[PDB]
């Protein structure tokens, strides 16, 4: 029937294109009085809206007056609620003041807003925060409607989530601040995530106070709900670049994108419930003097174009098509993803560093660490799928494993792992207090100067611009001439572990393998430091290990547990880690690793990096405070 699209937004869009929208939107001959109109509220005052409503009601009892604006205002929401309670008309809130979610709505009111509710916003922001492993949050509410329900939902989400969440004191902004009783509260806030549940002007004032009192840093990530960013044409300058704005709509989902959907839902409800009420457009005569089978609460189940646009008891889209965007550098909303009805469809899974949020931020303390798959080091595992999250002890590693060889798609799953390097980076970030970007990319193995072929994590850390790497490998020639390793925290060197009568590597059975010790599988892992060391020391032994090259570390362990592998030459730490879990203590380390190579594990740093001194001091403090025995007892668990 008649679709009164009262667009009260400030933009003067051509309303002539709205009359011809009946064709593609279910053009049926059942509605007779299809009086499609469109107005443009210029003056932003309740009086103009009241006059427009009273004029439209006199126009042959116009029913179903869909209203929408461009800026969310608390006055327009209350006015539309009063209109829907008095006139009892199924209004459809599209955007602006028509979509301002309130705390407690009227039961008889048919205010059907489009977008996400406060609980849905809390859920999606909790998902976004847990996808980046951010548990230190600070909730700040205000006097606007929707604070008690919001804090209740937050407390409920924290209770069921058993992965740890720093619940700091909630700051209330119900009263006006005078910079005498709120600065002390804002100073105590030390969490990274800053939940700012306020309005536009209040958020601007909070950002101004943070910039004037020295609260804006490279670690404070402000998050605002859809109430703050309720528009796509006005962006203040106080908000820095990187403000996560979870808005229910953007420039893609403009007014015209929802007008057609609302008209389709309305005409579908009319065609469905027309057999009950013949005269559907029955409203009051005018504004002077003036639910059984109407169309008031019978349009909360129309599924338009497959979208789950069902309304709740108060009226709100249960599964909206909200788009989560952030703030770019040139005062524009840069899209990073959206949220589907099933789960969170985060397009930009890699969170940017954002070393400079605002213009006056010269501090750059964002680093990056690269790690690979190693047997003696942290074992690569998967994230716990019982809650799609993990714990703080398991640092989420950004994996890069592909599905197939011919395919180019790389799964950037946020899997968490625990181990030696994980604890190293944890204690480093706890003592040195720096930010890192850890990622586990599928690479090769240890690279060296063989035909200038650099692969694996070694090839990555050889070049500059790389901060550091948790992988502390054996000391070599090229890996020490290219980059400057830190102090070796361990003294384990290269030795041999035969799976009794031998004297290590000084036995005469290696120089002449013809009579004694016939040539067997004596090779090490392909492209390893031991190969280079032997080639530099013994050419014939290197040729023998090359012509008898074995498989990886796991196959070497399987062969050692079987008995076919004679000897396994590697670092003493790896040999001790392997012997710590022997299946009967069969293989024994013949000679420790201090008479053959006497190497160590040095952190792969950058040549001429300012963080080298800090890493060296951190290592000397960690191995110079009396916890070396504790580390040896915790990591090395050799019982045999």
């Amino acid at each position: 029937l008649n679709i009164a699209v009262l667009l009260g937004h400030s933009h003067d869009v051509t309303e002539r294109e709205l009359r011809n929208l009946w064709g593609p939107e279910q053009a049926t001959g059942l509605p007779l009085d299809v009086n499609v109109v469109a107005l443009l509220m210029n003056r932003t005052d309740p009086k103009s809206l009241i006059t427009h409503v009273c004029d439209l009601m006199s126009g042959a009892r116009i029913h179903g007056l869909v209203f929408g604006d461009d800026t969310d205002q608390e006055a327009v929401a209350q006015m539309l609620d009063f209109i829907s309670s008095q006139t009892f008309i199924p209004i459809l809130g599209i955007h602006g003041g028509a979509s301002m979610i309130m705390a407690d709505k009227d039961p008889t009111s048919t205010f059907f807003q489009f977008g996400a509710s406060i609980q849905q916003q809390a859920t999606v922001m909790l998902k976004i925060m847990q996808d980046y492993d951010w548990h230190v949050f600070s909730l700040v509410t205000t006097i606007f409607p929707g604070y008690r329900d919001f804090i209740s939902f937050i407390k409920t989400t924290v209770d069921n989530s058993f992965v740890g969440w720093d619940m700091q004191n909630v700051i209330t902004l119900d009263t006006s601040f005078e910079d005498a009783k709120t600065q002390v509260q804002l100073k105590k806030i030390h969490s990274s995530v800053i939940l700012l549940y306020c309005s536009k002007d209040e958020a601007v004032l909070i950002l101004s106070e943070a910039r004037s009192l020295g609260l804006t840093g490279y670690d404070f990530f402000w998050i605002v709900p859809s109430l703050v960013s309720g528009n796509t044409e006005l962006i203040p300058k106080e908000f820095p670049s990187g403000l996560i704005s979870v808005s229910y709509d953007d420039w893609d989902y403009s007014l015209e994108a929802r007008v057609r959907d609302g008209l389709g839902i309305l005409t579908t409800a009319a065609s469905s419930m027309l057999e009950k009420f013949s005269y559907i457009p029955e409203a009051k005569a005018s504004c002077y003097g003036q639910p059984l089978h109407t169309l008031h609460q019978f349009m909360v189940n129309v599924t338009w174009d497959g979208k789950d646009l069902s309304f709740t008891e108060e009226g709100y889209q249960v599964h909206p098509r909200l788009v989560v965007i952030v703030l770019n550098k040139d005062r524009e909303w840069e899209k990073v993803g959206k949220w589907e009805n099933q789960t969170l469809s985060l397009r930009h899974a890699v969170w940017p560093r954002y070393k400079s949020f605002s213009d006056c931020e010269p501090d750059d303390n964002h680093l990056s660490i690269v790690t690979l798959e190693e047997a003696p080091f942290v074992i690569v595992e998967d994230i716990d799928p019982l809650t799609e999250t993990c714990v703080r002890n398991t640092v989420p590693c950004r994996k890069f494993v592909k599905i197939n060889n011919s395919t180019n798609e790389g799964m950037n799953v946020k899997k968490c792992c625990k181990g030696f390097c994980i604890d190293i980076l944890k204690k480093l970030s706890r003592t040195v207090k720096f930010t890192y970007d850890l990622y586990l990319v599928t690479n090769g193995k240890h690279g060296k100067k063989v035909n200038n072929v650099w692969n694996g994590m070694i090839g990555e850390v050889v070049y500059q611009r790389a901060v550091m790497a948790v992988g502390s490998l054996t000391i070599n020639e090229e890996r020490s001439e290219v980059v400057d390793f830190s102090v070796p925290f361990v003294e384990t060197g290269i030795s041999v572990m035969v799976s009794d009568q031998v004297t290590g590597l000084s036995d005469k059975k290696f120089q002449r393998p013809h009579d004694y010790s016939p040539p067997f599988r004596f090779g090490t892992v392909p492209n390893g430091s031991t190969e280079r060391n032997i080639r530099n020391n013994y050419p014939y032994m290197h040729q023998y290990m090359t012509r008898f090259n074995q498989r990886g570390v796991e196959d070497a362990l399987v062969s050692l547990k079987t008995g076919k592998l004679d000897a396994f030459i590697y670092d003493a730490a790896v040999l001790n880690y392997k012997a710590g879990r022997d299946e009967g203590c069969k293989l024994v380390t013949i000679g420790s690793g201090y008479i053959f190579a006497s190497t160590g594990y040095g952190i792969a740093l950058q040549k001429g990096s300012p963080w080298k001194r800090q890493i060296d001091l951190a290592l000397l403090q960690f191995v110079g405070d009396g916890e070396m025995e504790e580390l040896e007892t915790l990591w090395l668990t050799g019982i045999c």
């Epitope: 790389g410 990319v441 070049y463």
Partner: antibody, heavy 118, light 108 residues
């Protein structure tokens, strides 16, 4: 096979933002290796390296141009859109997006003409 | 940044003579240097990468050697298909500065 194509506004006024686009097909940008990197060469001078993005979607700009150089890519449409604001007559160069990998040979594209003038 | 001081472009070598592109280096000593060749209007094609191996479609006369700060590009047989400006771009440090440009011509 590996194909490259450079597009963008040929004539544009200075002190604005370009609309460079490095379209390609056959490969990707987050496929454990081959990526993309912007390279420009002014008239009468050598080439210049501004910035590039790796496979793990990491950004790293140039210290001398750390005011407007913002590199961005997309894995859904396989496009590389570069945003450079506050341009002038000195930035007039033929931008290239070639390979920056340690493979056998880096592949190069034709290139587009970008004449910045009022 | 690594100051790359390539040989001047006024280096004319006749057909048959050897070419020694003397692209010097700076205080920052590196080990890998990728040579390129930019023709008239075409794109710079990588000839020798890391100064140790050849690329696909590169003749065998283009040989690279040198260590420390002195890196040269030995050209055994100079032919007509070797026309174009040569650059010594290094991927070792963070600033990937290019060379001055080696313009080879016939001095007859």
């Amino acid at each position: 096979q590996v194909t490259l194509k450079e597009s963008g506004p040929g004539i544009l006024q200075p002190s604005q933002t370009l609309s460079l686009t490095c379209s390609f097909s056959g490969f990707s940008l987050s496929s454990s290796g081959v990526g993309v990197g912007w390279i420009r060469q002014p008239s009468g001078k050598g080439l210049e390296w501004l910035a590039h993005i790796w496979w793990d979607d990491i950004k790293r700009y140039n210290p001398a141009l750390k005011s407007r150089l913002t590199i961005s890519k997309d894995t859904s449409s396989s496009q590389v859109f570069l945003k450079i604001a506050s341009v002038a007559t000195a930035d007039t160069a033929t931008y290239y997006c070639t390979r920056m990998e340690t493979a056998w040979f880096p592949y190069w594209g034709q290139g587009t003409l970008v004449t910045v003038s009022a | 940044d690594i100051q790359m001081t390539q040989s001047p472009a006024s280096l004319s070598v006749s057909v048959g003579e050897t070419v020694t592109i003397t692209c010097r280096a700076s205080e920052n000593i590196y080990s890998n240097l990728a040579w390129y060749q930019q023709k008239q209007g075409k794109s710079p094609q990588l000839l020798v990468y890391a100064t140790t191996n050849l690329a696909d479609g590169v003749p065998s006369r283009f040989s690279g050697s040198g260590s420390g700060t002195q890196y040269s590009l030995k050209i055994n047989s100079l032919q007509s298909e070797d026309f174009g400006s040569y650059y010594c771009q290094h991927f070792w440090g963070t600033p990937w500065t290019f060379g001055g440009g080696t313009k080879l011509e016939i001095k007859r």
